[PDB]
Amino acid sequence: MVDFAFELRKAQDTGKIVMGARKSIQYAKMGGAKLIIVARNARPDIKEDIEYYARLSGIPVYEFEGTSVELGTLLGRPHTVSALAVVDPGASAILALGGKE
C-alpha cells in the first residue's frame, strides 16, 4: 500500500503542497490541485465544502485516517492541518492515493 507519512513528507520536500481548508477549496476551484487530502475530523461544514469543490472539479479526495492534529504533526507544523492540496507531487507517489482513474 502507499506509505502515507513517507509519501506525504516526500511531496512536501520535493513537490508543492498547499495547506489548509481555504487553500484546498481554492485550488480545487481553479483546478490547480491534483489530489486533496482531508483529515477524517475536518470540521463537518468545511469538510462538506472541500468535498463539494473537489467533486465539482473532478479532483480526487483522500481521507486521512487521522485527526487534524496528527496531520499537522505529520507535516511538521505546530498547528492543526484539516486538509491540503497536492499541487505537485514532486518525486513522491502521493497521487496514487487518488485511485487509478
Q: Domain boundaries in the chain?
A: 1-101
How far apart CA 35 and CA 24 sit, in angstroms, is 9
- CATH class of this structure's domain 1-101: alpha beta
Elucidation technique = X-ray
62, β-bridge pairs: 37
Give the Cα separation of 29 and 74 in Å (integer).
26
Return the SS3 of 30. coil
d(CA 61, CA 33): 10
Angle between helices 44-57 and 21-29 (to 10 degrees): 20
Structure resolution, Å: 1.8
Alpha-helical segments (H) within the chain? 4-14, 21-29, 44-57, 68-74
